[PDB]
Amino acid sequence: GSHMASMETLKSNKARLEYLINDMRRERMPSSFEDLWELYRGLANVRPALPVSDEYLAVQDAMLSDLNHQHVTDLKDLKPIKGDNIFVWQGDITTLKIDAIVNAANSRFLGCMQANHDCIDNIIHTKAGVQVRLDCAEIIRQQGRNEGVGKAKKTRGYNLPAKYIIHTVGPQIRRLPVSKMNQDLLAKCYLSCLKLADQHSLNHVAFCCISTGVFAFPQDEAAEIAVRTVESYLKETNSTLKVVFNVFTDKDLQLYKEALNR
Ligand SMILES: [Zn+2]
Q: Which structural domains are found in the chain, ordered by start?
A: 73-261 (3.40.220.10)
Instruction: Say whether 106 counts as a known binding-site residue.
Output: yes
User: Please, what is the end-to-end C-alpha distance for the chain in angstroms?
Assistant: 43
Centre of ligand 1 to C-alpha 257, Å, is 27
Centre of ligand 1 to C-alpha 92, Å, is 17
Give strand pairing partners of 97: 74
Nearest one of 241, 239, 248, 245 to 259, comparing CA atoms: 245
Instruction: Say whether 92 counts as a known binding-site residue.
Output: yes
Nearest one of 101, 151, 145 to 123, comparing CA atoms: 101
| C-alpha 246 chain-centroid distance | 10
Instruction: Say whether 120 counts as a known binding-site residue.
Output: yes
Do the bridges between strand 204-208 and strand 73-74 make them parallel or antiparallel, or are there none, so unpaired?
A: unpaired
Amino acid at 29: M
DSSP code per residue over the chain = --HHHHHHHHHHHHHHHHHHHHHHHH-----SHHHHHHHHHHHHHH--S----HHHHHHHHHHHHHHHTTT-EEGGG---SBTTTEEEEES-GGGEESSEEEEEE-TT-S---STT--SHHHHHHHHH-HHHHHHHHHHHHHHTSPPPTT--EEEE-TTSSSSEEEEEEPPP--SSS--HHHHHHHHHHHHHHHHHHHHTT-SEEEEEPPPP-TTPPPHHHHHHHHHHHHHHHHHHH----EEEEEE-SHHHHHHHHHHH--
CA 192, CA 152: separation in Å to the nearest integer?
6
Cα Dmax for the chain: 56
Centre of ligand 1 to C-alpha 121, Å, is 6
Instruction: Say whether 117 counts as a known binding-site residue.
Output: yes
CA 143, CA 151: separation in Å to the nearest integer?
13
Nearest one of 103, 244, 230 to 165, comparing CA atoms: 103
CA 205, CA 76: separation in Å to the nearest integer?
13
CA 192, CA 242: separation in Å to the nearest integer?
15
Centre of ligand 1 to C-alpha 77, Å, is 31
Centre of ligand 1 to C-alpha 243, Å, is 25
Taking residue 159's Cβ as centre, other Cβ atoms within 10 Å add up to 22
Centre of ligand 1 to C-alpha 93, Å, is 16
CA 219, CA 240: separation in Å to the nearest integer?
27
Instruction: Say whether 217 counts as a known binding-site residue.
Output: no
| C-alpha 84 chain-centroid distance | 24
Phi-psi region of 66 (alpha: psi -120 to 50; beta: other; left: phi over 0): alpha
Centre of ligand 1 to C-alpha 117, Å, is 5
Amino acid at 150: G
CA 7, CA 78: separation in Å to the nearest integer?
30
Resolution in A: 1.8
CA 115, CA 40: separation in Å to the nearest integer?
10
Task: Specify whether the CB–CB gap between 52 and 228 falls below 8 A.
Answer: no
